[PDB]
Design a protein around this ligand. Sequence first.
Ligand SMILES: NC(=O)[C@H]1CCCN(C(=O)[C@H]2Cc3cccc(Cl)c32)C1
Ligand SMILES: [Zn+2]
Length: 139
Amino acid sequence: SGAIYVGNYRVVNRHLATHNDWANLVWEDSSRDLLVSSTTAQGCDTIARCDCQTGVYYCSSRRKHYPVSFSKPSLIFVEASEYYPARYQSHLMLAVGHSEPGDCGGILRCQHGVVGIVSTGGNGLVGFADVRDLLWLDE
Ligand SMILES: NC(=O)[C@H]1CCCN(C(=O)[C@H]2Cc3cccc(Cl)c32)C1
Ligand SMILES: [Zn+2]
């Protein structure tokens, strides 16, 4: 579980979105595992606008934050699951680090702000759905 609260928007993993998220839908992309819904209260998270490849993510399965080096957002093959068939997920960034299914939603941050959220993992790797290209989250 986990979300990004910026302005009048809530950003979540598309496979974990609630009925409220779908009834206040702004945008969704199955290929990126993202869904954005509208909120009444204001969000104060700063979104990073950079090409940083180092940062810190929150791992709920260890109740700990971990520093990681991560790759550039790209198309990466993702195993079939209860939410999606086997496919390429776009805008995905990999790192060497611990992750378990319930870790999806944990925030990844660099010195400039919020980079993205945990979305994939397995075998000692963790995947992050990038949000730095969504320039409309601030306007
Ligand atoms: N974005 C997706 O397609 C995910 C849908 C839910 C499943 N998914 C995962 O990667 C799960 C399976 C697993 C094992 C260790 C860590 C994690 Cl985060 C996961 C993929
Ligand atoms: Zn940065």
